[PDB]
Amino acid sequence: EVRTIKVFTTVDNINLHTQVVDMSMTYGQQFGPTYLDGADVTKIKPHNSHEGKTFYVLPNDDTLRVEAFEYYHTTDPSFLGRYMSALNHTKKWKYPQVNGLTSIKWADNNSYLATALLTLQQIELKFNPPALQDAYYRARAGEAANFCALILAYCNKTVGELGDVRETMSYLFQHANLDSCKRVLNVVCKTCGQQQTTLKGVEAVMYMGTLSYEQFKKGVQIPCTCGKQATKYLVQQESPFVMMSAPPAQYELKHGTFTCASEYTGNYQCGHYKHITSKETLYCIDGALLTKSSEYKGPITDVFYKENSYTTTIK
Amino acid sequence: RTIKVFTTVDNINLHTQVVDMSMTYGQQFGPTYLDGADVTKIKPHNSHEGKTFYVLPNDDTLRVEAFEYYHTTDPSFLGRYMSALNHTKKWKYPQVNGLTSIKWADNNSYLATALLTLQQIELKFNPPALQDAYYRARAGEAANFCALILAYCNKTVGELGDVRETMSYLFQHANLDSCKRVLNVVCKTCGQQQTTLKGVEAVMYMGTLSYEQFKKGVQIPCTCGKQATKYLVQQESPFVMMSAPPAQYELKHGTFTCASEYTGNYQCGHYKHITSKETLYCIDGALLTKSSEYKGPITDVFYKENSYTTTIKPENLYFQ
Ligand SMILES: [Zn+2]
């Protein structure tokens, strides 16, 4: 009167849970949304050949919730669904090697993801969630569908939406081990005196307002709260890299003075990112396309620099 | 001879300048504006001494000032803001039913109902520019707020606007972080699937005007081919906005906060605003009409909210 097969369910592909399913009910009626080898089988009834196979499901009990938390480092019950929704699209993208880096061929307004992925491959960073570390290793090998889908899911963005590199890195850095990173700034006003500040973690590696790391060390003019103008400069830096960002204008990149950079062009509300990396010369990676030149000038928005330990000699 | 003036991108940080009356403002500052009017090709006058002029964010410091005030990095923003402001400063902003409206001009009806709506829902803007201008607009000086909405939406004065699109852009610049929405979709073949939305997506819905109908269930396609039922499980927000393609719809006193009526089509049309107070009021630019009931082609309805949790049991969804 009820026929069954044995299957395995999982939210992480590591902890497998035996389930006996009724062959007259769909997987969705028994599990909720269900996937077999990436394929959506929610509307399907079980087949004899499915016996023994592993199905991804969403976490709808305490056991699966704890396992999702330990793998993704999220308590949001919608995370896996939104990740699977992104993954439906990113699994169709192509991820060619371009000058030895995994890129992404243009699809679905994904240029900001391409330059973020290329950047992550050139700065020293360790991700805390096992799912993000695991997917990053796979991305490095040219299978970046899981990693891109996770990026979208951790930024709560959907495929096709406009992405911003600065916001994207900020979300990802929040899931990286940047706790030891340290930054000390000093701000001097001719009338108010000087004020020092110490930043840790993500705030210690990102700055908004200047693209030049060397200008940041020499001092930048910023509005002072007294209404006058003041000079802010970097006193100390402890981090494996720094990310310098600014509202775009026209900026010149020169070989050997930076690690990599992002350029933003086209319609501002739905624009296009290109990646520039410094190797033996400058390479402009534009999705699957490659060009090379001695220098590069354009609307740069983010520049990444290598760092270890810096202390100023100023004052 | 020469005179001292102030340049600015945000009207907070003022940069002292000396200009000469023999050259244009443009030769000295680049593109330059005085209360929205383009004075790039104008020579300074005696009577300009001490006035504050907007300039484009043409070095790193000014680009930081513009970013901190407007929360955009678009280099075209300031020019577009000024171009709109040169017009919106000439609009009239009468008080209608205790609310700041806009007298009709330049196809601005969508901005009027957006402005009237913002004065009736709880919303905090993140950009200082929008915060400051909203407060001024609440008090009746809405020219800068209206010009900023145009700039943020990449719309020019005179262009046909869309209220739903306009609110999307404004909500994008509002603190909606803690807003949350949980939905359930039930298919007889596929079972249940729950979805959670945050931010702008948690307060906006396209497909039905009726908040009550959203709670009770709406029919949608399922990828298996049958129709499924989508309904609201949980809502945490100070308001919700329900939108639909325009259709004849009856608004009843006490059942909604305010709504937008649209007459026209995809190329050209006109919006009016309907608010529920002691009775229903249709604010049509400067014009006020009071009615016990209202019937019209409604496209957006706003409702007050705080915390909602469904009492539907999935197993009973179709007992209706
Ligand atoms: Zn000061």
Ligand SMILES: [Zn+2]
């Ligand atoms: Zn179905």
